[PDB]
Amino acid sequence: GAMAPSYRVKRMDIAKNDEECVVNAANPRGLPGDGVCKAVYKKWPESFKNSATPVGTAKTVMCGTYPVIHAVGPNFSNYTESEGDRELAAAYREVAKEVTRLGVNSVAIPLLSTGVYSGGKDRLTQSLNHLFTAMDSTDADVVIYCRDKEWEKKISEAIQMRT
Ligand SMILES: CNC(=O)c1cccc2cc[nH]c12
Ligand SMILES: [Cl-]
Ligand SMILES: [Cl-]
Ligand SMILES: [Cl-]
Numbered sequence: 001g002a003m004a005p006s007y008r009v010k011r012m013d014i015a016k017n018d019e020e021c022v023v024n025a026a027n028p029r030g031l032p033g034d035g036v037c038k039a040v041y042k043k044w045p046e047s048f049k050n051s052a053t054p055v056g057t058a059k060t061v062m063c064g065t066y067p068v069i070h071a072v073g074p075n076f077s078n079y080t081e082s083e084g085d086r087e088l089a090a091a092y093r094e095v096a097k098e099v100t101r102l103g104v105n106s107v108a109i110p111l112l113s114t115g116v117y118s119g120g121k122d123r124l125t126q127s128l129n130h131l132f133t134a135m136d137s138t139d140a141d142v143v144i145y146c147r148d149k150e151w152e153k154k155i156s157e158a159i160q161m162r163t
Pocket of ligand 1: 012013015035036039110145146147148
């Protein structure tokens with residue numbers, strides 16, 4: 001475990017992370033996809049061997065010895081707000097199981113269902129709070145990765161409001 005488990009946020013490409021494993025915002029079919037998923041495909045393409053997994057689950061595939069945790073959030077274009085909320089919470093609970101099983105001391109993680117799968121709604125708070133519910137009982141250092149400058153400030157605020 002980490003000596004003093006922490007949350008941090010960085011505004012940069014998750015393919016450049018400084019952590020012991022990465023969470024992909026995957027699609028259910030193991031396709032290269034777009035956004036985060038395509039960045040992860042360019043950096044760790046070997047990790048897409050038999051990475052297909054259902055919505056609300058996570059599947060780990062090693063790229064060398066580097067673990068890529070493929071976490072499949074719901075596409076809110078297709079799910080009701082109610083069912084999508086349940087599947088988004090479930091994906092993050094499966095990420096916490098995988099991070100624990102792997103024995104890593106740090107993990108890089110994007111906010112699931114906040115981009116192309118957001119159904120055109122701002123889900124920063126919803127996705128981050130499900131991230132915290134899952135990861136708070138883990139002892140890995142968690143480093144959240146984002147792109148937007150306003151999102152960086154809001155995620156940083158949310159982390160510090162708990163400390
Ligand atoms: C944390 N987010 C990202 O890393 C990300 C998001 C969207 C597109 C690209 C391309 C490279 N990285 C991306
Ligand atoms: Cl960057
Ligand atoms: Cl997304
Ligand atoms: Cl962002």
